[PDB]
Enzyme design. Structure first.
Site, PDB file in Angstrom:
ATOM      1  N   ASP A  43      39.653   8.863 -14.623  1.00 52.95           N
ATOM      2  CA  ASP A  43      39.642   9.341 -13.474  1.00 52.95           C
ATOM      3  C   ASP A  43      40.928  10.296 -14.282  1.00 52.95           C
ATOM      4  O   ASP A  43      42.174  10.240 -14.349  1.00 52.95           O
ATOM      5  CB  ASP A  43      40.326   8.465 -12.773  1.00 52.95           C
ATOM      6  N   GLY A  60      48.064   9.429  -0.974  1.00 52.23           N
ATOM      7  CA  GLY A  60      48.101  10.825  -0.600  1.00 52.23           C
ATOM      8  C   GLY A  60      49.056  11.229  -2.201  1.00 52.23           C
ATOM      9  O   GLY A  60      49.857  12.720  -2.534  1.00 52.23           O
ATOM     10  N   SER A 113      47.719  10.301  -5.001  1.00 55.51           N
ATOM     11  CA  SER A 113      46.727  10.160  -6.813  1.00 55.51           C
ATOM     12  C   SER A 113      46.385  11.666  -7.412  1.00 55.51           C
ATOM     13  O   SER A 113      47.160  12.679  -6.588  1.00 55.51           O
ATOM     14  CB  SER A 113      45.305  10.034  -6.007  1.00 55.51           C
ATOM     15  N   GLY A 114      47.112  11.343  -8.431  1.00 58.92           N
ATOM     16  CA  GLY A 114      47.353  12.697  -9.031  1.00 58.92           C
ATOM     17  C   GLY A 114      48.563  12.805  -9.814  1.00 58.92           C
ATOM     18  O   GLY A 114      48.848  13.538 -11.017  1.00 58.92           O
TER      19      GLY A 114
END
Ligand SMILES: N=C(N)c1ccc(NC(=O)[C@H]2CCCNC2=O)cc1
Length: 222
Positions: free
Chosen positions: A85, A174, A176-177
């Site tokens: 991912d 919110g 994620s990343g």
């Protein structure tokens, strides 16, 4: 981010806020003036990257905005299992570096020794609401065996687990990343975890950035 607190204004120069249709979608990390690292499930239309932000609700003199000209997802990304991912974002305008906009170096060594870890982001808080001011928390990496017992047969070598036994400090919707920062180096990316958010028994799952050094390098210099 649940069970944390607002960050110091000058402690997050590598943080990016990712937007789609005028609304906050994900977190991201500046790793080069032309490139932002995020999660592959953050792939949405016409992505807008904001650097040098602290408070989302306010316009700030330090902030920079750029659109994305190229979105590079890892060839082996599997959406259903969340494996591999990771995604690279090429900025239309390279980042104008300042005290509040700087890249973060990556962790290259998978057998790296114990450091102090922290997570950060604009994701959902404990009260179930979205904060204006960016949130921070210290967390610790959870052993691979301990993680495989929490998520039977769901944990691969391309994932790392981290959490807080005392309060259950954890990343959320919110985040994620966003980055998992261990010893001033990028160690991981917010990938998935327990919903409702809380890490006391089921830690957060992060992309293991040390596995993608050669892929990151080849993509940037392509
Ligand atoms: N408990 C956790 N550690 C955890 C971490 C990330 C999420 N991610 C989301 O809900 C996603 C949805 C899609 C777009 N953006 C997101 O942030 C959930 C839980």
């Amino acid at each position: 981010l649940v069970h944390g607190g607002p960050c110091d204004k000058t402690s997050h120069p590598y943080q990016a806020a990712l937007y789609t249709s005028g609304h906050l979608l994900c977190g991201g990390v500046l790793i080069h003036p032309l490139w932002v690292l995020t999660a592959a499930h953050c792939k949405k239309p016409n992505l807008q990257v904001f650097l040098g932000k602290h408070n989302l609700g306010q316009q700030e003199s330090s902030q920079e905005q750029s659109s994305v000209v190229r979105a590079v997802i890892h060839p082996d990304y599997d959406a259903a299992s969340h494996d591999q991912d990771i995604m690279l974002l090429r900025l239309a305008r390279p980042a104008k570096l300042s005290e509040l906009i700087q890249p973060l170096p990556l962790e290259r060594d998978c057998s790296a020794q114990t450091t102090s870890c922290h997570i950060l982001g604009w994701g959902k808080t404990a009260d179930g609401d979205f904060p204006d001011t960016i949130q921070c928390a210290y967390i610790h990496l959870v052993s691979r065996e301990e993680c495989e017992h929490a998520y039977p047969g769901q944990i691969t070598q391309n994932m790392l687990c981290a959490g807080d036994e005392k309060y259950g400090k954890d990343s959320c919707q919110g985040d994620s990343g966003g980055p998992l920062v261990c010893g001033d180096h990028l160690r991981g990316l917010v990938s998935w975890g327990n919903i409702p958010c809380g890490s006391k028994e089921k830690p957060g799952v992060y992309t293991n950035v040390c596995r993608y050094t050669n892929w990151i390098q080849k993509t940037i210099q392509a």
